[PDB]
């Protein structure tokens, strides 16, 4: 499957087995002037947010984790 992956945002073939695209956001030390960080990649299981303001969005179609 294909998902948008960071750092350089492009569609990439997921490592086989991984069929879930994800979007992960969190707050940096620069969040006041730049906003939330955002990570994009593949996964075999939708990640579980550690704690705090980490929110994770998952889907299961090609290139569904578009950049906000």
């Amino acid at each position, epitope marked *: 499957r294909r998902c948008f992956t*960071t*750092p*350089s*945002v492009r569609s990439e073939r997921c490592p086989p087995g991984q069929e879930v695209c994800y979007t992960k*956001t969190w707050t*940096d*030390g*620069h969040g006041g*002037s*730049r*906003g*939330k*960080r*955002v*990570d*994009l990649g593949c996964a075999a299981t939708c990640p579980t947010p550690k704690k705090k303001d980490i929110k994770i969005i998952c889907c299961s179609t090609d290139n569904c984790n578009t*950049f*906000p």
Partner: antibody
Amino acid sequence: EVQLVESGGGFVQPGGSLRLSCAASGFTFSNFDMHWVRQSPGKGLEWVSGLDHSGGAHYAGSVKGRFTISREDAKNSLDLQMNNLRVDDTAVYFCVRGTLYHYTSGSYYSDAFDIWGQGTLVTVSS
Amino acid sequence: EIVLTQSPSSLSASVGDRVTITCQASQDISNYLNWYQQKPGKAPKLLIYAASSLESGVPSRFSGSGSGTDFTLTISSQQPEDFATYYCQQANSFPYTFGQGTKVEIKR
């Protein structure tokens, strides 16, 4: 996993030259700021030069005019042509990737140095 | 050229001790300061960027503080794999500059 590999180091006499190259695993140079950082017991870690994502080159003062950093687009080769070398240039040279962090406001480059090659040894001696 | 002054250049610590490393910049650099860890024979590893933000995979015992000129790296509980040399690095203006390093050694 993402890696950087250096090549072209060795032993050279004062006034000599050396062409270091860097090859990346898992990413493309033109999307990132790339840097060369050297390390020696005596001056520590020292940023030598950088070639940002848009194609502009930058150099440290002790090296400007003698070193040339360049990129072979789509060829996976970042080079540092070091000319008129000095004993003072003896160091381990690291190929270093400038970080690329994405925010809801866009992309930001070189907040830090996240990928470091294994290093190549350069020794200038008579 | 921004000068970074790391203190101490060396320090001894036991497992479980609280380690404190400081870094002082010769001028204001906001929070554009990073911390690296380096083992002998190896390349430095990025640990903290933006003074306080950890990289992925870095244990929670590492933490950073400061903005302006005075910065701190703290290891809440020294572990065996933490005996290394630690460098601060500013990303405020050209040229990028590093501190002289703090070598954490085994106390006995």
